[PDB]
RNA sequence: UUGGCACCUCGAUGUCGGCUCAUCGCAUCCUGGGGCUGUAGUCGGUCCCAAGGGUUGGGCUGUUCGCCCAUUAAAGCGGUACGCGAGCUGGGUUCAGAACGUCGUGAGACAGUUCGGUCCCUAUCCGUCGCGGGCGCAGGAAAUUUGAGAGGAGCUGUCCUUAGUACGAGAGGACCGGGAUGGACGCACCGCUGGUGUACCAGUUGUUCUGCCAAGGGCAUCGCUGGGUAGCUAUGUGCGGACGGGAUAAGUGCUGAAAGCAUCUAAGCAUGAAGCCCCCCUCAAGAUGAGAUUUCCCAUUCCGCAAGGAAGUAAGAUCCCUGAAAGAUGAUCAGGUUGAUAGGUCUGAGGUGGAAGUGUGGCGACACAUGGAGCUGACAGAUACUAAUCGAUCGAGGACUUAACC
């Protein structure tokens, strides 16, 4: 239930290779023009499918 | 199927049953996505029980809902004011009396909020 | 040989000349249709397609509108392909029914299992679970996984995994009843897979 | 559903009341027998010294149980308790007379001695 | 679906029917079978029982024979059933009458309501 | 096996038995096929080929082993650290306590006994079971597929007939061949039976709360109790292991010489098993040997002498979103505004069982009618009411040589 040998550098970032972030799915705000989430509220604007909160 | 939330049967019913009633009297919270998601039903489904508006359905909705209020100066509660106004409001909309306008994330949980409204 | 394939509704109860009930499987094979005929001078062996669906055109994309569209029919969904039949008697274009089959005609039907997950060795193996008390910190779990000498383990040691999904066959199955004018299919008994799924239904190889 | 150390009552005039299932004479290991079928068995409780007695071994046919039994019809019957009769080395009873309702699968069987034994069969 | 379950299964429904209810006294005519010779046989109870959607529906009659507790259960729209009659209906309470397999010697009594 | 020797291990190789999990050998327990018989038949004995599959549940004992009961076609012998303790138990052996017998002056001791006595470890690598991503497969894509090759499955009784025939003096009682029905095992499924069913229904107790009655809410294991849809389920249902082919083992032989005969053998021919390869089922082109078929897209722009490079795209796919028949997550599948993907709404099914209010009768508890009522989570049918917006990203331009058509 232990480690039978310390793991070396290659392996170590072969496996941390996955280990990482994709982007968001990002869009434009069109009302006031700045990036966004899909599907989501522009937060500077306000606004959302064209109309504000 | 439905949702648990991470909750037990009980504090699931009361944490939507204090939530109905606080989007009820605010016509607009943010919470998560997901409880709002859990919300929509059983809100539409209060709403229904409005726009019937029997003695029937004002002790159903009673036994659900929770006694706050909802306006003062008028010395008016949830109840009262779901079925007047929100039935006088609705009158011919059959259903999707709601709107989910889900927003980013949380800076602790990182959890998706969103906002809910009457629409 | 001959063979169809719809898709599975559900099940019900029907009787037989007689008090006697037969479990019933209900399937819908709208009219299956030919969308090609293989050959071995160029597929190396006789065999045919069948179509069954009516898509929307925002769904189907333009190489499937060709390949039917040397028939006079419409984009596909489930799409199978039949072997050692008669291929004298097909042709393309050409749609097939439920009217092949009759009411006593024994069958091997085959579906796809139903998804039941990442499940352990007792419900995916069959296996015995340990004793739930007299001291026993072991149940529900797979087994020794083998013997010491040759450090390490055999193959086909059995162990939890996603089960279900498997293409499974079905013998000597025996049709009951047909509806044509709806394009129904009864049969004595139950099939593999869930409701809307497919189901293609073959003359039985004995 | 019957199965080893089942304690069931016997149905007949022979001397013995309540009897206990050793085995099911079925394949090699048959696990239950519900009616129609045959299981060797010891008496635990009987009458006065009549034919059978106490901790005797002897074998049995099955007549009724509460794991009730299925027909092809989809008509299933179950009773509320569960009972048998004891035979001679043969598909015949020894006991003189039978005492409760029996069902239609001793017919299946050919146990027609008992069912004609029988003061109603179901 | 069950709509097309319920056009496909009409045919084998039938009509010859009375509506009866879990707790009333009842008998059936049922048919039977013995060596060519087709009998019928009377079975005579209390319905303990009743559920199902239209041809799998189905339901329980219990009685007592000879000192022993029976219980025969019937699909409803069978052919082999020549013919249903109650004797008496019975106010109850309840749709499943499980308590009775336990009792009887007169706690066992529906009280009649000449519905 | 009891052992002998002390070769690894005392800076630790955990030791009996049992559970789960199996696996291998065959000197085969059953099933299959045969020879011989002091084989009449039925049953058997012995030997040969065969390891495909199967090879019980209990009592006593810690036990292995063994005896016993009842079954079974049979209740096989062994190996795998007397398989398997980073998988379990820990009853026994084998710590410390105490006791009996016995020995000892005594402290104490006994393969003598008895009672009681802490079983740690988040899995790094390989391995195994499942799941994804990347790249490759001389252009890029959507589908269907071949099958090298792999794995699975592979068991068996009883009854009827043949026929009470053959055999037998009789008792008794067949081979073969037909047919039916089961056991165990496995696969699938929930229409039935049943279970479960914690956002369904009803009843009911105590307390508390909604100002009070009524009606209801909270907590009390879901408060308890009675039911219970979907789904998941077995004990439930359906189905299977069948038909058969090819080559063989033991065996049987035909023809036939060497060896004027005989001879199953050297030449040459044929039979012949639950076994081998197939037939059955599943996976399968990373089968770098990367396959085949059908269909779609076109062969653009910039540099760069060319080599080659990037930079917008086509077909198409994805990000993202609604969701489940799927699911740990990825994935898969259905859908993404000319659309029913989910929710909601309305119809229903099914489940619960006759709501609240009102009235009548009753002192009252309560009953009756209104009224198969009211309520209802996932079930299916409609319905564009709500949310699947607007976007964005990736994705080809198709090397050379040779042969044939041209």
């Known amino acids: 239930a232990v480690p039978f040998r310390r793991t070396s550098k290659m392996k170590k970032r072969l496996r941390r290779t996955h280990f990482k972030l994709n982007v968001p799915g990002m869009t434009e705000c069109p009302s006031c023009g700045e990036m966004k989430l899909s599907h989501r509220v522009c937060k500077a604007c306000g606004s959302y499918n064209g109309k504000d909160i | 199927s439905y949702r648990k939330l991470g909750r037990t049967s009980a504090q699931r019913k009361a944490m939507l049953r204090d939530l109905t009633t606080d989007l009820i009297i605010n016509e607009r919270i943010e919470t998560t996505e997901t409880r709002a998601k859990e919300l929509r039903s059983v809100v539409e489904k209060m709403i229904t029980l409005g726009k019937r508006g029997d003695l029937h359905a004002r002790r159903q909705a009673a036994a659900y809902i929770r006694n706050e209020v909802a306006n003062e100066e008028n010395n008016q509660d949830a109840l009262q004011k779901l079925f007047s106004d929100i039935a006088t409001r609705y009158e011919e909309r059959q259903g999707g009396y709601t709107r989910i306008m889900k927003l980013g994330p949380r800076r602790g949980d990182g959890a998706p909020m969103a906002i809910i409204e009457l629409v | 040989t001959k063979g169809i394939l719809g898709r599975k509704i559900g099940m019900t109860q029907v009787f037989a000349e007689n008090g006697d009930l037969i479990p019933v499987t209900v399937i819908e094979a709208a009219p299956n249709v030919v969308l090609q005929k293989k050959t071995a001078e160029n597929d190396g062996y006789e065999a045919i397609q069948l179509g069954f669906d009516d898509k929307r055109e925002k769904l189907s994309n333009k190489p499937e509108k060709g390949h039917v569209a040397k028939a006079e029919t419409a984009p596909k969904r489930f799409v199978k392909e039949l072997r050692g039949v008669e291929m004298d008697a097909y042709e393309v274009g050409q749609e097939v029914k439920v009217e092949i089959f009759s009411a006593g005609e024994i069958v091997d039907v085959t579906g796809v299992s139903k998804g039941k997950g990442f499940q352990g060795a007792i419900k995916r193996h069959g296996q015995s679970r340990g004793p739930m008390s007299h001291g026993s910190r072991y149940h529900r779990r797979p087994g020794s996984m083998g013997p010491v000498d040759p450090n390490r383990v055999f193959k086909g040691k059995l162990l939890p995994g996603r089960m279900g999904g498997e293409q499974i066959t079905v013998q000597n199955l025996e049709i009951v009843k047909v509806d044509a004018e709806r394009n129904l299919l009864l049969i004595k008994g139950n099939v593999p897979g869930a409701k809307k799924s497919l189901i293609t239904v073959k003359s039985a190889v004995k | 559903m019957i199965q080893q150390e089942t304690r069931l009552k016997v149905a007949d005039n022979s001397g013995a009341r309540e009897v206990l299932t050793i085995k099911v004479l079925g394949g090699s290991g048959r696990k239950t027998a519900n009616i129609g079928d045959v299981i060797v068995c010891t008496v635990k409780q009987a009458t006065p010294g009549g034919v059978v007695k106490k901790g005797e071994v002897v074998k049995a046919v099955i007549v009724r149980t509460k794991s009730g039994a299925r027909r092809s019809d989809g008509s299933y019957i179950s009773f509320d308790e569960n009972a048998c009769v004891i035979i001679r080395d043969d598909k015949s009873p020894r006991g003189t007379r039978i005492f409760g309702p029996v069902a239609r699968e001793l017919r299946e069987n050919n146990f027609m001695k008992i069912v004609s034994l029988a003061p109603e069969v179901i | ?115």
């Open chain 5, 1 to 115: 679906m069950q709509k097309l379950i319920e056009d496909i299964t009409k045919e084998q429904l039938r009509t010859d029917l009375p509506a009866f209810r879990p707790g009333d006294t009842l008998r059936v005519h049922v048919k039977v079978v013995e060596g060519n010779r087709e009998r019928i046989q009377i079975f005579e109870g209390v319905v303990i029982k009743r559920r199902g959607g239209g041809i799998s529906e189905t339901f329980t009659v219990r009685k007592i024979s000879y000192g022993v507790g029976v219980e025969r259960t019937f699909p409803v729209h069978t052919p082999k059933i020549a013919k249903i009659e109650v004797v008496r209906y019975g106010k109850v309470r309840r749709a499943k009458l499980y308590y009775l397999r336990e009792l009887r010697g007169k706690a066992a009594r529906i009280k009649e309501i000449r519905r």
